Amino acid sequence: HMAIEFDIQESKILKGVYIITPNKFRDLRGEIWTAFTDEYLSKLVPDGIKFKHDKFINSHFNVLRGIHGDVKTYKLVTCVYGEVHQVVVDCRKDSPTYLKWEKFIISYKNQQLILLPPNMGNSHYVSSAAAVYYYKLAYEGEYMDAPDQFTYAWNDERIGIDWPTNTPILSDRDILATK
Amino acid sequence: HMAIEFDIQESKILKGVYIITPNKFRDLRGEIWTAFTDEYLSKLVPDGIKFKHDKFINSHFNVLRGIHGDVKTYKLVTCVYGEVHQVVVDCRKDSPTYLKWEKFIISYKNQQLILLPPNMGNSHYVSSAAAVYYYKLAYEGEYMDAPDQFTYAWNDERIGIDWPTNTPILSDRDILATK
Ligand SMILES: Nc1nc2c(ncn2[C@@H]2O[C@H](COP(=O)(O)OP(=O)(O)O[C@H]3O[C@@H]([C@H](O)CO)[C@H](O)[C@@H](O)[C@@H]3O)[C@@H](O)[C@H]2O)c(=O)[nH]1
Ligand SMILES: Nc1nc2c(ncn2[C@@H]2O[C@H](COP(=O)(O)OP(=O)(O)O[C@H]3O[C@@H]([C@H](O)CO)[C@H](O)[C@@H](O)[C@@H]3O)[C@@H](O)[C@H]2O)c(=O)[nH]1
Structure with missing residues (x-):
């Protein structure tokens, strides 16, 4: 069977940003993979600080958030x-x-x-x-x-971010920041 | 601005099975919502048993897992x-x-x-x-x-589950269970 594996490396551009690549089980049904375990990824954050909150953000084509x-x-x-x-x-x-x-x-x-x-x-x-x-x-x-x-x-x-469009869909918050 | 909320109900059919409904912030972009916090949802399992593992399962149309x-x-x-x-x-x-x-x-x-x-x-x-x-x-x-x-x-x-098909896509594990 596959062990849960994570490749971890630091960004070569931004100090303290990590890039984590999980492995996946692939078959005729699709894929199973692990995003996170305390055992493997709790070390990405200082001791005493816990991953205690999970969110989903569902967005349409051409939405930019940030x-x-x-x-x-x-x-x-x-x-x-x-x-x-x-x-x-x-x-x-x-x-x-x-x-x-x-x-x-x-x-x-x-x-x-x-x-x-x-x-x-x-x-x-x-x-x-x-x-x-x-x-x-x-x-x-x-x-x-x-x-x-x-x-x-x-x-x-x-x-100067290279975005694939000059015309994204924006919240009022993100519009306000351009002015 | 919205407070994170969870409607938490016990099943009327199976004791100890709970149905948790989050609220969502819906706008022109789509939606934002909290699936989990340690505060709200750690109280639904015994003391000393921690949600420590996050998995994603992507499946095609007509896959049945179980x-x-x-x-x-x-x-x-x-x-x-x-x-x-x-x-x-x-x-x-x-x-x-x-x-x-x-x-x-x-x-x-x-x-x-x-x-x-x-x-x-x-x-x-x-x-x-x-x-x-x-x-x-x-x-x-x-x-x-x-x-x-x-x-x-x-x-x-x-x-005796009602399923919407007689020909689901199954793993060898799930075919073996039918023998
Ligand atoms: N019911 C519910 N409502 C929630 C929640 N989170 C935010 N809200 C509400 O959504 C509205 C919009 O919240 P915003 O934070 O401005 O949403 P946003 O999606 O524009 O901003 C988010 O953007 C992320 C990145 O930039 C893009 O990936 C940041 O990582 C993140 O920290 C930030 O919150 C607020 O009114 C807030 O109170 C939630 O979990 N539940
Ligand atoms: N790389 C990686 N591999 C993983 C992982 N989990 C299982 N695998 C591998 O995928 C293969 C299939 O694993 P299975 O556990 O049979 O996958 P499955 O999708 O048929 O079974 C899953 O079904 C769920 C429900 O019935 C349907 O929602 C159960 O609640 C869950 O406990 C169960 O694991 C195995 O070889 C296993 O070692 C993983 O997280 N990463």
């Missing part, structure tokens, strides 16, 4: 249906790579989970008809909702 | 893409409802998360073109893989 982060939250993110351009921005003002970025195109053929430490910009664009984005959160205290998060404009010129 | 269980795993399951016929079977030998079953028809339009204690039969049938099934596991010690699990035939006449 760029969003908060001071508290370690994020393990992936796309479990469809295809997203996942873009991590370095939003640590102290970092020598502040406002550098790296793209992961996550889909049926590239199943990566991306580990974001706090003070990072998270963003994704939906290149498939629809996308199911899976989002694990590790944080102390209460959930950091939108009023406690920071926002950079998806198209901030200082960041 | 009926499967093991002696120690608590399971939280839903369908996050497409639609499944989710069937829980009471496989607790001493239970008054042994081999009774209950069906749920789960999709983003009916976002039920089903909590199964150990010694239950879990099964799903994909009625959509494809489905993604999200599976969270609470257990002590090591994972019970297929060889450490039990199996009941999907079409076992003592259970």
